[PDB]
Design a protein around this ligand. Structure first.
Ligand SMILES: [Mg+2]
Ligand SMILES: [Mg+2]
Ligand SMILES: [Mg+2]
Ligand SMILES: [Mg+2]
Ligand SMILES: [Mg+2]
Ligand SMILES: [Mg+2]
Ligand SMILES: [Mg+2]
Ligand SMILES: [Mg+2]
Ligand SMILES: [Mg+2]
Ligand SMILES: [Mg+2]
Ligand SMILES: [Mg+2]
Ligand SMILES: [Mg+2]
Lengths: 95, 208, 86, 137, 107
RNA sequence: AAACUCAGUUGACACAAAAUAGACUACGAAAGUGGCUUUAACAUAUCUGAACACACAAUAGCUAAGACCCAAACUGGGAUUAGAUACCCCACUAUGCUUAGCCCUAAACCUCAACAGUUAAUCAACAAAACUGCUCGCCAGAACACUACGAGCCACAGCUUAAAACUCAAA
RNA sequence: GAGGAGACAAGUCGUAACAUGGUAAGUGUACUGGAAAGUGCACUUGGACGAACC
């Protein structure tokens, strides 16, 4: 399992966010562990909304290997996305 | 340095000055005549003409010194020598005449030979080719070899594994082991040699 | 391949000094340009780069030969100053 | 006769001999000093294989193979095998400017075998095939 | 003999395309370039192989160890002698060229 | 690391490319041309003369049929990286090769037009010294703009010719 | 409706160019890529190769 790390900003543009979301989707398809960190360009809730927005584009593809956590003295948020297992994907399909 | 560059270190050796004049080559006579008109540094308070003076033991005492406690360092050195001599005498008395011929009782010889056995022939130095440093093997000059042997002895004696064991006894035991080619100091020398051999392939990284 | 073996690029060691034999062989290859040719043929040197390198080497050789000629010409004038003081 | 660096010519009547054998009958120690691996195969005067030794076969791996030390090890192993298989003097033919080029000969001698001739057979095309493109680092 | 420079550079009165394209002018400078800057590894290899096959017991490797030490001392001595020998020199040659400078202009 | 279980010697074997010579400076209008042999063959006894026509024009590229050792856009895999749609490693295709047509572009630059002449009284700078006569081609602030429109063309994401508006005091 | 250019004009993702700009740069062309751009083939120096021998 290869770990791909990304660093984003709270005030990231929508176009750049889309580009990085496409890259993250490619990583998930490749079955890598995507460690996304978000820094202040803002509130922690608003920053975590970015993680939620990113994962929205992967409804039955990606999930949170590790949930959002405040790191770097609370300055940054961090999370780890992973591809859904076979069993999780089957459960999603059944749902 | 309070001594001007014109000052030369003194040569404290009775035989050198008592050497017959006829035995002096032209260069030696020139050297003496030149020294007749050269400023000389005052003799340091460490070395004298005493026939019992030993530079190696003096340097070992200096290395063992902590915070300018020359008295204590000399005390530890003499206690170590006395302990070594006592242990060798005990072995000599308790041993049969067949091996008494080989049993050594001279503590100074024992110390010299122990340090010589501890001396490492090859060391590891960082050498850089292209922008990366690697622990390349390299010969160690004589000064570095002697210093490494002495420092390994002192550090191994100073280790905390030996608890409530005074430095005299610790150092005497380690010196005897080194003399007989055993003990942690010789083990460290062998570890250095083993690492050098393991990195033998990097010898060419040296440029000098 | 279709030639006889052990005639081309073969040197005979004298008294067993393979180091001397290899030095002689290396001098032969270098003077004939085989070492440089192999080093350059390791990777494909595109024709423009080859032409530029050849031109640069020609200019370097011209300059070095002229400078060596000048040095050898003036070397005699390295004598002791005959009119020292005045 | 005086020593001449040129090898004796086959068919020509020559007084040179090594272990009672002519030059054309001496075994040949083919060395191949690739960029990162040195191979050494000692064959007879009739291309009958006798010994083989390579940096890779000597336990060296990855970059360690392309070093003079590995080449010496391979040369010593090949020399030992050839010695036990009945080889004293050899004509050395090396094709490659790798790091093991000369270290292979040094090891091949330190292993006992004597060298009578050193041959360079590095394949130098008169162009022909196109090599791979240059590297930009 | 120096290679000919007649009709080599792109100049007026040179119908042929240039043969040479020197980045710097082909005019001798009044100075020459500065002098541009392991040892005894076989004895080391012998000593280390003996150590490897003997368990690093120097007592029975004494001969190889003494050879290695003597060779290292000789290496240092060679460094010293080479340094003193190195010390025609570029400085003297530049002095000579200054005495006889290249005059690419008129006077 | 991935990749192949292929690797060494020897012998047979190209529709690919053409060490050394070449430190030569030649041939051709330019593009180009440096393995060998042969055949054919290198216009003009006065110069200049195409957006106004004819013939060419490297590499890339298109169409159809062959060759395929090696190299190799793209693609795939390894590695690096925050990422690496790159640089580094491996595999392989179009493509480079031959034939018949297209395509008509290059930092196609020696950025220095052809012809004739001079070296004398120099010449912004640099570059490859300064000029004279004659002829054709071209240029007239930058950007818009190797652009839009129009036109021509085997070109259909193209090439050639090629503006204006808005903007600025610069470039 | 949409495109193109220019300007006003503060941001987002990179750091492509200027130093050998960290893979020298660029021309033609082909494919590819948020994006500057990457790569192949040929070409240019509007780069250098340190300018006696080492
Ligand atoms: Mg005409
Ligand atoms: Mg025309
Ligand atoms: Mg064409
Ligand atoms: Mg193909
Ligand atoms: Mg051209
Ligand atoms: Mg164009
Ligand atoms: Mg157009
Ligand atoms: Mg149109
Ligand atoms: Mg950059
Ligand atoms: Mg660059
Ligand atoms: Mg390019
Ligand atoms: Mg690419």
């Amino acid at each position: 399992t290869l770990r791909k790390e990304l660093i984003l900003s709270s005030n990231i543009g929508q176009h750049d966010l889309d580009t990085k979301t496409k890259q993250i989707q490619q990583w998930i398809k490749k079955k890598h562990l995507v460690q996304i960190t978000i820094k202040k360009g803002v509130s922690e809730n608003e920053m975590e909304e970015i993680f939620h927005q990113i994962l929205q584009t992967m409804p039955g593809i990606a999930t949170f290997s590790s949930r959002p956590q405040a790191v770097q003295g609370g300055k940054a948020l961090m999370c780890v996305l992973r591809a859904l297992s076979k069993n999780e994907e089957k459960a999603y399909k059944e749902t | 340095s309070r001594y001007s560059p014109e000052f030369k270190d003194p040569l404290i050796d009775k035989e050198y000055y008592r050497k017959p004049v006829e035995e002096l080559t032209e260069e030696e006579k020139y050297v003496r005549e030149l020294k007749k008109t050269q400023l000389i540094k005052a003799a340091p308070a460490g070395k004298t003409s005493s026939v019992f003076e030993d530079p190696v033991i003096s340097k070992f005492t200096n290395m063992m010194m902590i915070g300018g406690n020359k008295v204590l360092a000399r005390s530890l050195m003499i206690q170590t020598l006395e302990a070594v001599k006592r242990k060798q005498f005990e072995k000599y008395h308790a041993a049969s005449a067949e091996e008494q011929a080989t049993i050594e009782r001279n503590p100074y010889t024992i110390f010299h030979q122990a340090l010589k056995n501890c001396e490492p022939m090859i060391g590891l130095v960082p050498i850089l080719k292209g922008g990366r440093f690697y622990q390349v093997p390299v010969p160690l000059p004589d000064r570095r070899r002697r210093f490494l042997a002495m420092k390994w002895m002192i550090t191994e004696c100073r280790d905390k594994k030996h608890q409530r064991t005074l430095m005299p006894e610790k150092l005497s035991h380690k010196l005897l082991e080194a003399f007989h080619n055993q003990g942690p100091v010789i083990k460290r020398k062998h570890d250095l040699h083993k690492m050098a051999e393991a990195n033998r392939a990097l010898a060419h990284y040296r440029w000098w | 391949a279709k030639h006889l073996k052990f005639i081309a690029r073969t040197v005979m060691v004298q008294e067993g000094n393979v180091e001397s034999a290899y030095r002689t062989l290396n001098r032969i290859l270098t003077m004939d340009g085989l070492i440089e040719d192999i080093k350059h043929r390791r990777y494909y040197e595109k024709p423009c780069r080859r032409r530029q390198r050849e031109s640069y080497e020609r200019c370097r050789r011209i300059y070095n030969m002229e400078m060596a000629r000048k040095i050898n010409f003036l070397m005699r004038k390295n004598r002791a100053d005959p009119w020292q003081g005045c | 006769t005086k020593f001449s660096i040129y090898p004796p010519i086959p068919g020509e009547e020559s007084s040179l001999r090594w272990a009672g054998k002519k030059f054309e009958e001496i075994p040949i120690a083919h060395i191949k000093a690739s960029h990162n691996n040195t191979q050494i195969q000692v064959v007879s005067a009739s291309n009958e294989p006798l010994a083989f030794a390579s940096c890779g076969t000597e336990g060296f791996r990855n970059a360690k193979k392309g070093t003079g030390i590995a080449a010496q090890t391979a040369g010593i192993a090949a020399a030992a095998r050839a010695k036990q298989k009945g080889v004293i003097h050899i004509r050395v033919v090396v094709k490659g400017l790798g790091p093991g080029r000369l270290s292979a000969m040094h090891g091949l001698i330190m292993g006992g075998l004597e060298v009578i001739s050193i041959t360079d057979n590095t394949p130098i095309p008169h162009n022909g095939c196109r090599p791979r493109k240059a590297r930009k680092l | 003999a120096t290679p000919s420079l007649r009709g080599r550079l792109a100049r007026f009165g040179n119908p042929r395309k240039p043969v040479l394209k020197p980045n710097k002018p082909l005019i001798l400078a009044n100075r020459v370039g500065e002098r541009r800057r392991a040892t005894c590894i076989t004895e080391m290899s012998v000593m280390m192989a003996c150590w490897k096959q003997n368990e690093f017991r120097d007592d029975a490797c004494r001969k190889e160890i003494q050879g290695f030490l003597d060779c290292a001392a000789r290496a240092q001595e060679a460094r010293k002698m080479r340094s003193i020998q190195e010390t025609l020199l570029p400085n003297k040659l530049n002095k000579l060229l200054q005495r006889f400078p290249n005059k690419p202009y008129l006077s």
